[PDB]
């Protein structure tokens, strides 16, 4: 009822905005409004406090390990990107390189499958993709594109199962544009504008790549959500062809328009569902063939992040809770409680090996009060 966490980490002295986890080591990085990133372990109670990264000029808003596990990439709201090289089996993380090419970074992601690669987008609309040198960790710019005319709100890599030379990225902007890039050449593969979405204003803020098994082999289907309730599902391998476009909620006159804002999108291959989470608290589960709502949840305040995992849909909320629903039946299986302010981000950890009988997944949060909580969740 009050705090059902397993353990906690509370060294930040301001809101925790971002949380990331090493691909193979039991290592968390969190980034905060105290302009610091902290490194700590995910497999012990209490966590081991590994250490602290410094050098930021503002709040840390991304903490991303590279897919092969050699590097950690962090970004802040003053436009800095720092790259740290793992040392001593991952116990220490040493500054290798950094840059400050923009006024403010909105998002940064490492590539999920291609080593030593990341991209970021900025408030001036610009899009950047870099690699990290394997020998000295130096920054290698692949592209820098200035096409979006307002904040580049989000990016998502596509075609990630095609090898190390297929490096493609979709980005979106508050100016209603969506662009796909070949990151190695910097070329714009396609651009969706307002004129191609029925003339509608759609300040995009969320992107999520579909699982290939849901799309008959297509590794470039992306769902896009705007801050005014527009949902677009696009085929990035057919020039951005629109597979679906709809307004997902009709607000009452009294409601702030931001109530329709689509903050997070997640796909389930098993259930052929796509879930979207709104500022008004609605979580809408769409069938991915007919693009109709099949089920919905209603939280008492804004959704901050959604994540399908097996049968479950996990949903963090600005009321400080993380909900665990059975996606098909709707059962509230668990509620992670303990935060006294909102949950701003979270990660989900699986036991690495199927032992001989089943250990629990962990939800690890980033809290607005400066705390991360570790929860063991059912299944």
């Amino acid at each position: 009822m009050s705090n059902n966490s397993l353990t906690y980490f509370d060294k930040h002295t301001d809101s925790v905005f971002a949380i990331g986890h090493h691909p193979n080591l039991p290592l968390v990085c969190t980034g905060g409004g105290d302009n610091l990133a902290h490194l700590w372990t995910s497999h012990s109670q209490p966590p081991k406090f590994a250490g602290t990264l410094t050098g930021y000029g503002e709040s840390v808003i991304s903490c991303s390990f590279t897919s092969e596990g050699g590097f950690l990439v962090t970004a802040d709201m003053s436009g800095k990107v720092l790259v740290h090289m793992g040392q001593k089996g991952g116990a220490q993380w040493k500054l290798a390189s950094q840059m400050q090419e923009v006024e403010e970074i909105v998002w940064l992601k490492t590539h999920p499958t291609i080593a030593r690669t990341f991209a970021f987008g900025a408030t001036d609309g610009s899009v950047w993709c870099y690699q990290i040198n394997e020998q000295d960790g130096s920054l290698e710019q692949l592209m820098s594109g200035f096409v979006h005319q307002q904040d580049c709100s989000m990016g998502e890599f596509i075609n990630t199962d095609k090898g190390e030379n297929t490096l493609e990225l979709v980005t979106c902007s508050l100016d209603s544009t969506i662009v796909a890039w070949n990151c190695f050449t910097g070329q714009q593969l396609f651009k969706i504008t307002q004129a191609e979405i029925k003339g509608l204003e759609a300040p995009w803020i969320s992107l999520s790549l579909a699982p290939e098994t849901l799309t008959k082999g297509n590794s470039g289907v992306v769902a896009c959500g705007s801050n005014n309730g527009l949902l677009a599902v696009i085929n990035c391998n057919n020039g951005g062809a629109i597979l679906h476009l709809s307004t997902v909620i009709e607000l009452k006159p009294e409601q702030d328009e931001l109530d329709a804002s689509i903050e997070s999108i997640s796909w389930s291959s098993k259930f052929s569902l796509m879930a979207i989470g709104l500022v008004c608290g609605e979580i809408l589960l769409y069938d991915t063939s007919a693009w109709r709502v099949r089920h919905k949840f209603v939280l008492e305040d804004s959704v901050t992040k959604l994540m399908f995992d097996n049968d479950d849909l996990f949903a963090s909320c600005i009321n400080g809770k993380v909900y665990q629903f059975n996606a098909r039946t709707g059962q509230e299986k668990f509620v992670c409680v303990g935060h006294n302010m909102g949950v701003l981000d979270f990660i989900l950890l699986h036991p690495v090996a199927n032992t001989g009988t089943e250990q629990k997944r962990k939800v690890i949060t980033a809290g607005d009060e400066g705390v991360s909580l570790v929860f063991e969740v059912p299944n």
Binding site: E58, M77, D151, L258, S302, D368
Partner: peptide
């Protein structure tokens, strides 16, 4: 110490 734009959306821009 600044807060990213999504935080202001969660709060509907207090």
């Amino acid at each position: 110490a600044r807060r990213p734009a999504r935080c202001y959306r969660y709060q509907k821009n207090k």
